[PDB]
Amino acid sequence: GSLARAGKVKNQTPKVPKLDKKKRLTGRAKKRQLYNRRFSDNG
Amino acid sequence: HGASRYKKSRAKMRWKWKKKRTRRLQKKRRKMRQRSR
């Protein structure tokens, strides 16, 4: 007899949007970005 | 199960008395079956 609390924190969570950012590039260019950001800058 | 009855390491009821109680229950059940049939 405690089904009235379903979704308590779901409903109590403050609502914030997801903003805009840049379009997240995909595909072969994503792999090239991971590759060079992993092996180039580090020294 | 098999022949590893008793072996009280678990700290349980004594197997001999468990067997005796089960046998008493079986005797009662057999008597009830005989009465019914």
Partner: protein, 185 residues
């Protein structure tokens, strides 16, 4: 009823999905050969495992066994034709030593980058996609094209490509320039 057209897989999933060293070397390979996705090197390992299993089975047989002097020579000549083996090779043991880079060297993008044309491996990939390259009398826009030892001699720009002698440049920009010149004059 059911069509009799055969079809089969080309890649095998790795198992143990999060092996750090395997992931790192895969990233090395795909980044430095400019390929697009983890499926590609898996197809390459699938192929290489096929030749490797063939070679292992052949090497299990004794010498002078007709099965050997047939299948082994067929495999050897096929490998030297695809360019994975040099003239210094004569045995199947040398086949057994084939590696992933030695198989990735024959990709079309890798070959065009090596020969020039594109100053980047990704530039080579994108050019192949934009169908600017020819293997002689025939134009292919498949970057995973594997070239043979009789093909690298005639890899060059497609005749219908702007870099191959076709339509020079941006028709929009050219028309705008000519219209502006005509209006000014």
């Amino acid at each position: 009823p059911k069509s009799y057209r055969n079809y089969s897989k080309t890649a095998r999933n790795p198992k143990r999905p999060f092996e750090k060293e395997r992931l790192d070397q895969e990233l090395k390979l795909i980044g430095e050969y400019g390929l697009k996705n983890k499926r590609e090197i898996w197809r390459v390992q699938y192929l290489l495992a096929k030749i490797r299993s063939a070679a292992r089975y052949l090497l299990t047989l004794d010498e002078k066994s007709s099965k050997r002097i047939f299948q082994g020579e067929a495999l050897l000549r096929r490998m030297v034709r695809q360019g994975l083996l040099g003239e210094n090779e004569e045995k199947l043991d040398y086949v057994l030593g084939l590696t992933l880079p030695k198989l990735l060297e024959r990709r079309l993008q890798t070959k065009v980058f090596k020969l020039g044309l594109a100053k980047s491996v990704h530039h080579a990939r994108v050019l192949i996609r934009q169908r600017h390259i020819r293997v002689g009398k025939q134009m292919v826009d498949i970057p995973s094209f594997l070239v043979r030892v009789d093909s690298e001699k005639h890899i060059d720009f497609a005749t219908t490509s702007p870099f191959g002698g076709a339509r020079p440049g941006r028709v929009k920009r050219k028309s705008l320039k000519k219209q502006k010149e005509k209006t000014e004059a």
